[PDB]
Ligand binder design. Structure first.
Ligand SMILES: Cn1cc(-c2ccncc2)c(-c2ccc(OCc3ccc4ccccc4n3)cc2)n1
Ligand SMILES: [Mg+2]
Ligand SMILES: [Zn+2]
Length: 305
């Protein structure tokens, strides 16, 4: 059963899930139980599912099991602070989606798989890894005793899988820019309609980006350390680009590592700050994410000075 410190601090947007891997499954179950009720899933089926998901994450520096649970936690914090906005089915689906959203990640970008001519890039031409992550989710669900959605009607099953598919695909950052642009226009013109399924899908998309990027919304020591893990992957990809005979972009080129603070400044300006700004506009209770993001921006600026 969850430690008292975790019971309290799990409610903070900037909660960090700690270094004890065996505690993460219980942390996830607790979040499921709190958002979705204890009768939502059969406990034994749920536990079996969680452990098979864990098993199909790889031991890569960043896109790993810890990332999955962290992203799920941010979604939990959003849902908890926006009571009554999201349906029972959306809440179950999104938390499951977050847990599954990087399944079987290799630590390489879609761009790298394309340049490598990987079989997955022939199968899934766009949002390559994200299509795979969804494929893996379904495969796990179809294992004997793993169908946590077995108590839903066929219709609700199809519905929640579609919620999950859309949510997982939305974590393709390439899609974020267009999505956020549309949402910002809808907000400014007062045309955003949460009762409109297409608009709803966009908001959920933005939520997924916000959760996926949430390492930039932690307190500075956490954010600073996490940056090590993301660059470990990017620089390895850069190495691999060089081995293909292709000059990587500076972000992936370990030779350009001294420019990390400037690169971070660019990312916060172009992606992170706009993302959380738009999210807070639509869901005011998410403001702590934006505050924490601005704080980290300031820290990077301080590094530069
Ligand atoms: C999907 N996603 C999550 C993250 C993230 C970010 C921070 N903490 C955890 C996760 C990122 C991400 C985006 C940009 C980035 O660097 C931008 C950049 C650009 C030019 C550069 C030139 C030289 C050196 C470095 C340079 N970095 C690093 C990570 N993408
Ligand atoms: Mg991903
Ligand atoms: Zn992710």
């Amino acid at each position: 059963n969850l430690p008292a410190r975790i019971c309290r601090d799990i409610e903070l947007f900037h909660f960090d899930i700690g270094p004890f891997e065996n505690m993460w499954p219980g942390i996830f179950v607790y979040m499921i139980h709190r958002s979705c009720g204890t009768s939502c899933f059969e406990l034994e089926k749920l536990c079996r599912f969680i452990m098979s998901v864990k098993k199909n994450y790889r031991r890569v520096p960043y896109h790993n099991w810890k990332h999955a649970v962290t992203v799920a936690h941010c979604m939990y914090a959003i849902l908890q602070n926006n009571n009554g906005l999201f349906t029972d089915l959306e809440r179950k689906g999104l938390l499951i989606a977050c847990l599954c959203h990087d399944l079987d990640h290799r630590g390489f970008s879609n761009s790298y798989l394309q340049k490598f001519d990987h079989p997955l890039a022939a199968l899934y031409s766009t949002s390559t890894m994200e299509q795979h992550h969804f494929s893996q989710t379904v495969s796990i669900l179809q294992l004997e005793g793993h169908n946590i959605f077995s108590t839903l009607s066929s219709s609700e099953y199809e519905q929640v899988l579609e919620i999950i598919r859309k949510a997982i695909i939305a974590t393709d950052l390439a899609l974020y820019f267009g999505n956020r642009k549309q949402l910002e226009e809808m907000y400014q013109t007062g045309s955003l309609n949460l009762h409109n399924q297409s608009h709803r899908d966009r908001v959920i998309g933005l939520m997924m980006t916000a959760c996926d990027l949430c390492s930039v919304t932690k307190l500075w020591p956490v954010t600073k350390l996490t940056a090590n893990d993301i660059y470990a992957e990017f620089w390895a990809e850069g190495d691999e680009m060089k081995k293909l005979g292709i000059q990587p972009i500076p972000m992936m080129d370990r030779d350009k590592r001294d420019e990390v603070p400037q690169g971070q400044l660019g990312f916060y300006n172009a992606v992170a700050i706009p993302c959380y700004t738009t999210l807070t506009q639509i869901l005011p209770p998410t403001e702590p994410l934006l505050k924490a993001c601005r704080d980290n921006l300031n820290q990077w600026e301080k590094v530069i000075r």
